[PDB]
Amino acid sequence: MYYGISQFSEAYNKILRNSSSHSSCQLVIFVSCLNIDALCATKMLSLLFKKQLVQSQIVPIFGYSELRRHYSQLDDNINSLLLVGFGGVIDLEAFLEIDPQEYVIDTDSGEQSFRRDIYVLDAHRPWNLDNIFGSQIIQCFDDGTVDDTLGEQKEAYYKLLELDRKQRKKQIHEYEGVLEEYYSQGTTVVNSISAQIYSLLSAIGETNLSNLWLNILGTTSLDIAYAQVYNRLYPLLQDEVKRLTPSSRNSVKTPDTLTLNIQPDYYLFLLRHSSLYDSFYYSNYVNAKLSLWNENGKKRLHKMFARMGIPLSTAQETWLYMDHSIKRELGIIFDKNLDRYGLQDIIRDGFVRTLGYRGSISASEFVEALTALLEVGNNSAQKLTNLRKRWVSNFWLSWDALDDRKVELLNRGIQLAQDLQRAIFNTGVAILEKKLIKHLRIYRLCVLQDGPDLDLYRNPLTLLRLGNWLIECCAESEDKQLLPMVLASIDENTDTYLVAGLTPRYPRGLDTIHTKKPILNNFSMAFQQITAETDAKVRIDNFESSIIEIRREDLSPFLEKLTLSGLL
Amino acid sequence: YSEWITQPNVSRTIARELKSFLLEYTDETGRSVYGARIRTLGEMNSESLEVNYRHLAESKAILALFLAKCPEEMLKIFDLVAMEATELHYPDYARIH
Lengths: 568, 97
Hints:
This is part of a larger assembly, with chains A (about 575 residues) and B (about 100 residues). With about 575 residues, chain A is an alpha/beta fold.
């Protein structure tokens, strides 16, 4: 283990000593764009370093090639680097062409110091042993997993390091096998970066309501994919909310009151900024629970809305303008007629932020708006770079959306979220009508060849959102076994497909013995092994390893080779 | 005939009989048409229950004879019975209609 939770403050003080020189800017923050949790963590760190007046550089990175190019362009004066949301699984010193000897200064005296110290922060569990153990430049902020579950891995790695007859070779083989079985494991995430930096801040003691709100947003960002982690971390955020809230409850609403509350936050889509009927119609959970893509789904939706006794016009009215009667009896109405249709899990308790008279807002709606701003905020290797430029630019739009003075941007993000949900819903219903998903014994392939708004899915987050829709829909199909799906989208301008390796997940609210065991996305090593051989001009640069760009001509041979591959 | 219909016991008997006719009228294929009709009435909130005269004539004919002779009060009574049946299928339907 490198940096435990209890010793994060030591790293903070070391960084402060290294680069609290206002004459220059010797600290640079690298953040993976198209990642909400990384954005929230970077906002926390930016506010914190604004407090101590430490000049910092914030660079949003989309692909690994961009990271290496920037590091090559990176000046030598910068003695402190921060990686947010990436770098914890790959050989950075090999990736960035780094040896300890070039960066080491004042080597003497059992100690070592370096002219450039890089601190990574991501929660992907395949912690690179050469990066967590066999280096001093790379500094990782462990969340208690390496120090507790990688003891055998630590011993094997140190045995290999110290050893560079027959029984000696046998033990070397055993240690290497242990290391390898530790590897070849799907990339999974156990904690949220926002919670880790919030714990660090609490250790420093510079917390406030805004930082707690940022931590709530960052944790909520992982609810859709990693709901078990969200349930694990929910009590800590709840206790922090109870602690920080002033005792002057039920106070008269002033234009300056900023209140965080814990209240029923039902698992709908943009409830407070859309009609109840549309919230149900666009909720991924409800859609998966009744398979609304069929014509029977809309009829059954009307069936519920009739069964509760709510007029359809009232349900289709905007949330703010509904009658106060329904707006004050929604909870009881859900209590009466939710278990009937199996949608009892919709009822949930979450955190709601109210800023004076500006109206309330829930964390789920805010993170949906942020993701929408990330996605659609605005010969072959040139237009792709322009797409990277636009994707990175949308990161700053999503970042500035955090400011309470830019609520107009938040409204645009909400509209974009509604439109993106509509587009993903329509694409899913069209796919499930035409049955573009071809079931195999390895993975359920699905490639979009032509159709509407296909240019929207070249954005990685849009493809992930479509994957969330389809995986949620297929999760409620008990007949359909657990199996990953693969999505591709041809970019006509570049004549390339965007293959997105996905992973199955357990249905939300379905908690079992196997549910506690996470699903591991083994598309990483399969993709890399297939690409290393049989050169097909594949572009694997995303920090999310299960996303590649493939030539249109090479798409079919690549998929055939992947079927021949049993790695995943 | 209208004065006969105004009798309270007659009104309650006709109400129960119309309830049974709605819930149990079965055609050749065997499905109860009016139960699904109440289902659809609630789902689309039509507020109107299209009841065929032939169905009421074939089963419990004197009800159809009265309807063809004195519809004025049994319109109210059968409308109330339809509302109660909708309450059965769709609880608290009185909110919408």
